[PDB]
Design an enzyme around this catalytic site. Structure first.
Site, short mmCIF file in Angstrom:
data_model
loop_
_atom_site.label_atom_id
_atom_site.label_comp_id
_atom_site.label_asym_id
_atom_site.label_seq_id
_atom_site.Cartn_x
_atom_site.Cartn_y
_atom_site.Cartn_z
N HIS A 207 0.81 -1.27 0.03
CA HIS A 207 0.11 -0.07 -0.01
C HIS A 207 0.14 1.69 -0.19
O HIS A 207 -0.03 2.34 0.04
CB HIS A 207 -0.88 -0.09 1.24
CG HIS A 207 -2.39 -1.25 0.50
ND1 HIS A 207 -3.04 -0.64 -0.01
CD2 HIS A 207 -2.02 -2.55 1.58
CE1 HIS A 207 -4.09 -1.47 -0.21
NE2 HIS A 207 -3.04 -2.15 0.68
N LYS B 103 -4.84 -9.15 -8.76
CA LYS B 103 -5.56 -8.41 -7.82
C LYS B 103 -6.98 -7.18 -8.22
O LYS B 103 -6.52 -6.52 -9.47
CB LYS B 103 -4.53 -7.61 -6.90
CG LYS B 103 -5.41 -7.40 -5.69
CD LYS B 103 -4.53 -8.64 -4.36
CE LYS B 103 -3.89 -6.57 -3.69
NZ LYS B 103 -5.38 -5.98 -2.67
N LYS C 226 -15.25 -1.19 6.76
CA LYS C 226 -16.57 -1.75 5.19
C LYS C 226 -17.20 -2.76 5.86
O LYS C 226 -18.24 -3.02 5.99
CB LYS C 226 -15.71 -1.69 4.23
CG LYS C 226 -16.01 -1.53 2.74
CD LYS C 226 -14.99 -1.47 2.14
CE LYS C 226 -13.87 -2.64 2.05
NZ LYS C 226 -13.21 -2.56 0.63
N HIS D 99 -4.24 -3.49 6.72
CA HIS D 99 -5.22 -3.47 6.10
C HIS D 99 -5.57 -2.78 5.85
O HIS D 99 -6.07 -1.23 6.22
CB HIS D 99 -6.63 -4.33 6.65
CG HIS D 99 -7.52 -4.23 5.64
ND1 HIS D 99 -7.63 -4.68 4.09
CD2 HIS D 99 -9.28 -3.07 5.69
CE1 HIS D 99 -8.90 -4.58 4.72
NE2 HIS D 99 -9.90 -3.57 6.08
N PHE D 100 -6.05 -2.29 3.69
CA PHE D 100 -5.78 -0.56 3.80
C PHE D 100 -7.95 -0.70 3.60
O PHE D 100 -7.87 -2.02 2.94
CB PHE D 100 -5.46 -0.23 1.97
CG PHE D 100 -5.85 0.61 2.22
CD1 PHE D 100 -4.68 2.04 2.67
CD2 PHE D 100 -6.33 0.99 0.98
CE1 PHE D 100 -4.93 3.26 1.45
CE2 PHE D 100 -6.69 2.14 0.57
CZ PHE D 100 -5.64 3.80 1.33
N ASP D 101 -8.55 -0.38 4.26
CA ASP D 101 -9.73 -0.38 4.51
C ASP D 101 -10.47 0.28 2.70
O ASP D 101 -11.37 -0.43 2.35
CB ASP D 101 -10.05 -0.65 5.59
CG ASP D 101 -11.49 -0.84 5.85
OD1 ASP D 101 -11.93 -1.87 5.70
OD2 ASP D 101 -12.80 -0.07 6.30
#
Length: 124
Positions: free
Chosen positions: A12, A41, A66, A119-121
């Site tokens: 990220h 991805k 999310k 985690h990139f949400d």
DNA sequence: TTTT
């Protein structure tokens, strides 16, 4: 084994560019960090912030995930992000994506000791 | 792989 937060870093983080360079930039980087190996991805977003300041988002706005979890965090600020969206044509092997550059807020999930992004949400 |  790659740590969840190292994974995050790889997947990220491009701190050495303030923003996207070409439109090829997604194609250069997705593949650069190996998100095009068995995976193709669907999308990936890249924060062009220093690390130091992205784990800063862990102590900022505690927002829902999310997906329903309580350990996500909204960036009190706007961060430049490039987002790479799979284009229909991108065929794993040889994958392709649209580079979109933005200043926005990003929401990342944190955990551990120390509290950091794993985690990139989302972005808003 | 719906990106912990």
């Amino acid at each position: 084994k790659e740590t969840a937060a190292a994974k995050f870093e790889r997947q990220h983080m491009d701190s050495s560019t303030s923003a996207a360079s070409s439109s090829n930039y997604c194609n250069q980087m997705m593949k650069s960090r190996n998100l095009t190996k068995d995976r193709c991805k669907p999308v990936n977003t890249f924060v062009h912030e220093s690390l130091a300041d992205v784990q800063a988002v862990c102590s900022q706005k505690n927002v829902a995930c999310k997906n329903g979890q309580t350990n996500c965090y909204q960036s009190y600020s706007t961060m430049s992000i490039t987002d790479c969206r799979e284009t229909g044509s991108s065929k794993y092997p040889n994958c392709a994506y649209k580079t979109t550059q933005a200043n926005k807020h990003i929401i990342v999930a944190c955990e551990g000791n120390p509290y950091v992004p794993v985690h990139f949400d989302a972005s808003v």
